[PDB]
């Protein structure tokens, strides 16, 4: 997060950071207290054996325990039609073996229903644990920033990406720069304000640097993958 500010301990209980080998690598979001929504590029073949994974919730500063006080991931389900070259369909699901009862600062986000009628220049918010300016370390505290959604037709211009955005992917941010996410902000909750309720409609998949002109962030559109999530929940039980 570049150009943002530190996130106060308000009400943003939809950010879960996954820790492997006692170090933070990728994050995620929760929609129901039985699954974790996150990216799929961090669930590659070298990242197998989901038993060596823990999840933390309600933790702003990443220092509250050491190899304990976490939730062990039981099984991870990834998208079958995932490509490592173009980074398409980059959505993975992780299931926790704990009930994760609702308490203070614990409230998931509902899935977006088909037909939201989103505005073109809609306002959105980003959050995660990443670098500060460029090629930095993991932020100790939680920071957030404000981003805007740009059109896919304008994002497919020959000067910004040269038609490298699939219909299942959307672009967001500022074309002028100074507002982007650096390396380490995997997953990330991209929610918006509508009908007095937040809707998780984005998912950070890949990017080309941060705070760079003509290089906006890339967020996964979960509108097409809405039916795929419901199929995994019904097949589980």
């Amino acid at each position: 997060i570049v150009g943002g500010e530190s996130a106060l301990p308000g009400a943003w209980p939809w950010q879960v950071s996954l820790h492997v080998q006692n170090v933070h690598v990728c994050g995620g979001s929760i929609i129901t207290p039985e699954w974790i929504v996150t990216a799929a590029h961090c669930v590659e073949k070298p990242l197998n054996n989901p038993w060596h994974w823990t999840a933390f919730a309600g933790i702003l500063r990443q220092s509250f325990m050491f190899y304990g006080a976490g939730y062990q991931v039981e099984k991870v389900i990834s998208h079958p039609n995932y490509d490592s070259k173009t980074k398409n369909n980059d959505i993975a699901l992780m299931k926790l073996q704990k009930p994760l009862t609702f308490n203070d600062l614990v409230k998931p986000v509902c899935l977006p229903n088909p037909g939201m009628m989103l505005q073109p220049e809609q306002l959105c918010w980003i959050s995660g644990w990443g670098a500060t300016e460029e090629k930095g370390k993991t932020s100790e505290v939680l920071n957030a920033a404000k981003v805007l959604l740009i059109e896919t037709q304008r994002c497919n211009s020959r000067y910004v990406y040269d038609n490298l955005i699939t219909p299942a992917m959307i672009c967001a941010g500022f074309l002028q720069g100074n507002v982007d996410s650096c390396q380490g902000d995997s997953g990330g909750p991209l929610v918006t304000s509508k009908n007095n309720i937040w809707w998780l409609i984005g998912d950070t998949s890949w990017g080309s640097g941060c705070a760079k002109a003509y290089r906006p962030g890339v967020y996964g559109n979960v509108m097409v993958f809405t039916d795929w999530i419901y199929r995994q929940m019904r097949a589980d039980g």
């Binding site: 980074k87 490298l164 074309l175 002028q176 080309s208 003509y214 290089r215």
Partner: protein, 286 residues
């Protein structure tokens, strides 16, 4: 004299703002500033008292909080020429020439840009070597100015992909803050600092292409086989100074002989009868 000015000039329209023409015929002022420029046919409506047109934004701004007048006159097309010169300094620094247009054509500015001294539409050729997609031309920029800002970064699999600023053009760019060329509006008695230059056609020494200069157009000014030229008069102070009128009370009347007439000749008062008599004893000072 107001009569001598309107007679020898083919006046078509004359209106004053914050000033009445009654007091002009006889007064005293300190100084008079006159501004003259041609009138475009298509942009003839942008010269009104208050308009956000192309002329009042990049060519000449008309002040409203001062007593001024507007003069619309025409000039014959015989033995006349139009001077089209670029008042910009940094534009001609990199080898700017002329518009090379036909006669009876005037150039007006609609998109004006202002840059600082540390500006060079030229990239460092040592950095552009590691570029494969959208590789801009580069040359040696003179000392004292930084080279063009370009960055090399990979998106998903393209190792050699260089991104620069001022894309696609400074007139309509996606990131105006990143490009050093910024739009400016001319003020009271100020010219346009310069026009937009396409960096893609710039750069031996850094020499931009003559077709890279964008943000200008032209239009004829022929009406009834005559050219239209605008004139603006601004008065600085009133009831003071030395620039007084002449047709206020002395309009060079005629000598009326036969009857007695009052005298105000060279500071002498009286009455007398006139009589023309051939004399030759007068000198050039008496």
């Amino acid at each position: 004299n107001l009569s001598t000015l309107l007679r020898l000039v083919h006046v078509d329209s004359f209106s004053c703002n914050n000033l009445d023409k009654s007091k002009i015929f006889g007064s005293c002022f300190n100084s008079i500033t006159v501004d003259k420029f041609a009138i475009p046919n298509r942009r003839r409506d942008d010269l009104q008292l208050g308009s956000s047109g192309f002329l009042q934004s990049s060519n000449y701004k008309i002040d409203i909080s001062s007593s001024s007048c507007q003069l619309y006159y025409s000039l014959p097309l015989v033995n006349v020429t139009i001077n089209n010169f670029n008042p910009s300094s940094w534009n001609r620094r990199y080898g700017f020439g002329s518009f090379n247009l036909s006669s009876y054509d005037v150039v007006y500015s609609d998109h004006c840009f202002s840059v600082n001294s540390d500006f060079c539409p030229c990239a460092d050729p040592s950095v552009v070597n590691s570029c494969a997609k959208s590789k801009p031309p580069s040359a040696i920029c003179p000392a004292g100015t930084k080279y063009r800002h370009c960055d090399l970064d990979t998106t998903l699999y393209v190792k050699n992909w260089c991104r620069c600023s001022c894309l696609p053009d400074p007139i309509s760019t996606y990131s105006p803050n990143t490009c050093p060329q910024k739009k400016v509006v001319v003020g009271i008695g100020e010219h346009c600092p310069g026009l937009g230059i396409n960096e893609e056609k710039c750069g031996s020494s850094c020499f931009c292409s003559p077709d890279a200069f964008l943000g200008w157009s032209f239009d004829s000014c022929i009406s009834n086989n005559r050219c239209n030229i605008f004139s603006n008069f601004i008065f600085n102070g009133i009831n003071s100074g030395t620039t007084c009128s002449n047709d206020l009370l002395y309009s060079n009347t005629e000598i009326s002989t036969g009857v007695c007439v009052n005298y105000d000749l060279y500071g002498i008062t009286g009455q007398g009868i006139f009589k023309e008599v051939s004399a030759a004893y007068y000198n050039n000072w008496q």
